[PDB]
Amino acid sequence: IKEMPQPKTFGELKNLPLLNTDKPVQALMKIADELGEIFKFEAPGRVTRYLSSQRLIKEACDESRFDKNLSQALKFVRDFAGDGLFTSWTHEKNWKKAHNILLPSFSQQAMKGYHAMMVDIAVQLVQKWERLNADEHIEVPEDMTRLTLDTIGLCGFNYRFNSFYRDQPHPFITSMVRALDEAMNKLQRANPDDPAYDENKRQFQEDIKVMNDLVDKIIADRKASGEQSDDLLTHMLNGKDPETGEPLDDENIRYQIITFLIAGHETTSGLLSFALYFLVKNPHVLQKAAEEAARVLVDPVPSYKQVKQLKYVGMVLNEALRLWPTAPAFSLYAKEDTVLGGEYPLEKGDELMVLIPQLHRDKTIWGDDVEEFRPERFENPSAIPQHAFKPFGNGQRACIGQQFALHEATLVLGMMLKHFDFEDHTNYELDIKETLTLKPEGFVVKAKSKKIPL
Ligand code: HEM
Ligand SMILES: O=C(COc1ccc(OC(F)(F)F)cc1)N[C@@H](Cc1ccccc1)C(=O)O
């Protein structure tokens, strides 16, 4: 039985002021590097424990001992994502009901139906880059966020955000990005009751009303039309939970749509941005991925079956998720009193945070080359220890979007590698911006067209 370390304190604010930064996840990663596999983190009225080792996280991933907790970030996002899948407790009726209804919508089989809509947006990205003049560059996270937002609009509810036609965001996205900024900024606030936050609170309520009004209108407009498009909204309007026999109500459907728009905007765009960063910084890896793209993608438009054959591209995406898991943490609570790692007693209700980027740097798992970009690490999943790699979370509360995200990212990265050579023309220094998620900021490249027609 060991006493766990704790980072520096600020009197009655305890560790809270360590989060007073634009990069709190990266600050927690530096704390983990200093203090090791487990540390205590206290704020007024709250204690959690940050886990960084596979040794402890493999125990935390035991669903008999630990269930998903809503971190403060997820409790603040719940003010607009409601009892959608991502911000519901496992024990709320709407979690299992929506999980049962939506699982068939997110299977590998469902991806065959979403593929044509994903190709529509991927072709828009390739045509944009084909049309750049010689003196121009690509704003990588900007263009990847245009793509992933448009994909989930089209597969989610047959709506075109038309992100490649504008710089000014859609009114829904203005409100969603500002609501996510308020939720994440509110985490650090020592004095949230201070009148100085009255305007923030007014604006947040306005942004919730904008998101609710626009998504409620999408649902009402679909029910009125009777249109049976092959999208998540049709699946939610028609689907019945096998257990309860009940469908989702229109309020829960709205929360699921808001949740899918958050995910599409924030996550897959980060993965694609980090993958392109690592490829331009590792030219031998880029060459190997480009060779696979050329060998497999033999038609003007990729098919579902061709994307399934981009195995090395899939290993590139896993190695990008290893070094920079764009959704960088998840939270657990102890279902009963238990001992972690034979050393750290926990009481029922005690909270843990899994720091995914640190888990992914555990040298006892990956070896001394842990900071190197080596997709070949993922050749054989049986050679990877249990719970070493958790970019989609754990167990029944793992990401429902995992198949969707990896299909879109594999398709797009394969088309990018087929159609262009890339230059790191600025010798870009990685700068990671934190929203709900991690993304490179200011990452720019030049593309040189291979002049292969679509
Ligand atoms: C690379 C892309 C993505 C990453 C890294 C990612 C990561 C994650 C992680 C780590 C969780 C678990 C969170 C927790 O335990 O608190 C999660 C849950 C979830 N993700 Fe994703 N995600 C991705 C893409 C998507 C997409 C595209 C969608 C939907 C369109 C989506 C929908 C969800 C939902 C609904 C949950 C909650 C599942 C449940 O508890 O029932 N994700 N995701
Ligand atoms: O450690 C984190 C990391 O923040 C994120 C949590 C989830 C998250 O969601 C996702 F990973 F899905 F993106 C993104 C960031 N958050 C903690 C920070 C905190 C605040 C107050 C007291 C103690 C601790 C939290 O939100 O509870």
Side-chain angles (χ1 to χ4, degrees):
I1 303 287
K2 270 155 99 193
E3 159 176 2
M4 70 184 65
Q6 182 175 9
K8 62 194 176 193
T9 56
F10 299 74
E12 288 308 291
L13 294 183
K14 306 202 178 147
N15 301 121
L16 185 55
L18 296 176
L19 303 184
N20 190 3
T21 169
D22 56 350
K23 297 174 179 184
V25 169
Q26 293 162 83
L28 287 160
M29 290 169 63
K30 184 183 173 214
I31 292 161
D33 276 335
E34 295 196 354
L35 297 188
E37 65 178 340
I38 186 166
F39 61 88
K40 186 182 175 110
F41 190 101
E42 288 187 289
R46 182 153 171 224
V47 52
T48 196
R49 304 132 191 97
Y50 281 87
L51 302 188
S52 290
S53 67
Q54 181 269 357
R55 180 185 87 89
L56 297 181
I57 290 163
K58 74 186 165 179
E59 295 196 24
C61 287
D62 178 351
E63 297 178 280
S64 77
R65 298 165 68 197
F66 301 95
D67 180 32
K68 164 160 167 155
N69 182 53
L70 304 188
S71 58
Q72 189 65 66
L74 269 55
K75 288 179 171 195
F76 286 154
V77 170
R78 178 168 170 123
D79 282 338
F80 49 100
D83 60 354
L85 285 172
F86 175 70
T87 50
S88 57
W89 304 89
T90 303
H91 54 72
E92 285 181 282
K93 174 173 183 186
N94 279 336
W95 179 69
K96 187 69 176 215
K97 179 175 164 182
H99 170 84
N100 287 343
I101 291 166
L102 280 165
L103 266 176
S105 287
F106 278 103
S107 63
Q108 259 322 299
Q109 177 67 20
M111 299 305 128
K112 301 178 180 173
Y114 302 131
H115 182 84
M117 287 181 281
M118 295 188 178
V119 165
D120 180 304
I121 309 308
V123 165
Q124 290 191 52
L125 177 73
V126 170
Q127 288 180 318
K128 181 181 175 171
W129 292 359
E130 288 287 18
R131 292 170 176 162
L132 292 179
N133 303 289
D135 57 1
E136 286 193 274
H137 64 263
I138 293 162
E139 302 182 328
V140 171
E142 290 80 1
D143 273 350
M144 297 302 100
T145 305
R146 289 187 172 99
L147 173 116
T148 62
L149 171 63
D150 277 26
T151 297
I152 195 55
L154 192 54
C155 297
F157 51 95
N158 202 29
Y159 184 80
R160 285 186 181 266
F161 283 100
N162 283 316
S163 298
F164 291 115
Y165 291 87
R166 15 140 146 247
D167 300 294
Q168 280 311 95
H170 191 288
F172 177 91
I173 298 295
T174 296
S175 282
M176 187 191 77
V177 167
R178 191 160 53 210
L180 286 166
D181 184 51
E182 173 68 2
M184 300 306 293
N185 281 148
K186 195 159 39 176
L187 289 185
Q188 69 124 259
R189 283 186 200 155
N191 199 14
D193 292 352
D194 193 319
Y197 304 115
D198 286 349
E199 173 54 24
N200 301 86
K201 290 169 181 191
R202 189 208 60 79
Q203 180 58 270
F204 189 61
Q205 292 305 314
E206 177 189 302
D207 286 331
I208 294 166
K209 177 177 160 51
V210 167
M211 289 186 277
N212 287 348
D213 286 348
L214 294 180
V215 170
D216 288 349
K217 177 172 193 289
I218 287 291
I219 297 162
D221 286 349
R222 179 65 64 82
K223 293 189 97 181
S225 269
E227 281 181 6
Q228 296 298 302
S229 45
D230 203 349
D231 61 30
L232 291 165
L233 176 51
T234 299
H235 304 158
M236 288 189 284
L237 289 172
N238 294 343
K240 307 300 197 182
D241 171 20
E243 183 199 339
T244 68
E246 298 172 16
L248 298 182
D249 59 69
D250 287 347
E251 193 186 85
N252 187 260
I253 293 174
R254 167 230 288 172
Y255 291 138
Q256 306 301 348
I257 290 171
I258 291 167
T259 302
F260 303 150
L261 293 168
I262 292 168
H265 190 275
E266 290 294 275
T267 63
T268 313
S269 47
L271 168 52
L272 280 163
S273 298
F274 286 117
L276 187 59
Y277 166 84
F278 281 117
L279 289 174
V280 304
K281 293 304 191 176
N282 296 274
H284 293 309
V285 178
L286 166 52
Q287 178 172 353
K288 188 169 172 184
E291 289 169 350
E292 180 179 76
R295 171 168 47 79
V296 169
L297 296 178
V298 296
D299 298 323
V301 198
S303 68
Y304 170 86
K305 285 197 331 302
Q306 287 166 349
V307 173
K308 297 305 108 179
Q309 294 310 134
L310 295 173
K311 309 268 177 123
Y312 194 73
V313 172
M315 291 166 46
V316 166
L317 291 169
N318 281 328
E319 179 71 344
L321 287 174
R322 186 185 65 83
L323 283 167
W324 288 112
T326 185
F330 61 96
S331 187
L332 301 164
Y333 72 82
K335 291 166 50 68
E336 302 290 344
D337 295 348
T338 196
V339 177
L340 197 66
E343 288 178 333
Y344 302 105
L346 305 172
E347 292 170 337
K348 177 182 188 199
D350 280 356
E351 190 199 315
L352 305 169
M353 293 301 305
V354 174
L355 196 49
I356 309 176
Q358 291 297 113
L359 166 65
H360 289 175
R361 284 164 171 78
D362 186 341
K363 283 190 204 177
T364 74
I365 301 301
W366 305 101
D368 296 332
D369 71 351
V370 65
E371 282 287 327
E372 300 191 357
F373 191 79
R374 197 165 57 81
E376 293 78 6
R377 291 176 206 280
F378 288 96
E379 283 280 9
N380 184 4
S382 304
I384 298 173
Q386 281 197 273
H387 300 305
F389 181 64
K390 304 305 290 195
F392 294 105
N394 186 62
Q396 69 185 335
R397 300 306 308 274
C399 183
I400 204 166
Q402 173 180 353
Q403 310 315 131
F404 188 99
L406 294 177
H407 192 78
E408 177 175 19
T410 307
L411 169 63
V412 168
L413 188 53
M415 292 183 70
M416 288 168 47
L417 289 171
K418 175 180 176 172
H419 285 281
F420 309 93
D421 296 310
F422 293 94
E423 181 183 5
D424 176 22
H425 67 293
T426 73
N427 192 12
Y428 169 72
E429 195 171 330
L430 189 58
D431 185 358
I432 299 171
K433 178 169 177 189
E434 306 194 11
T435 54
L436 179 65
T437 59
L438 306 184
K439 294 192 188 173
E441 183 167 33
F443 177 36
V444 294
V445 301
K446 291 180 176 174
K448 194 161 131 59
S449 180
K450 295 191 176 288
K451 297 293 177 188
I452 302 166
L454 286 156

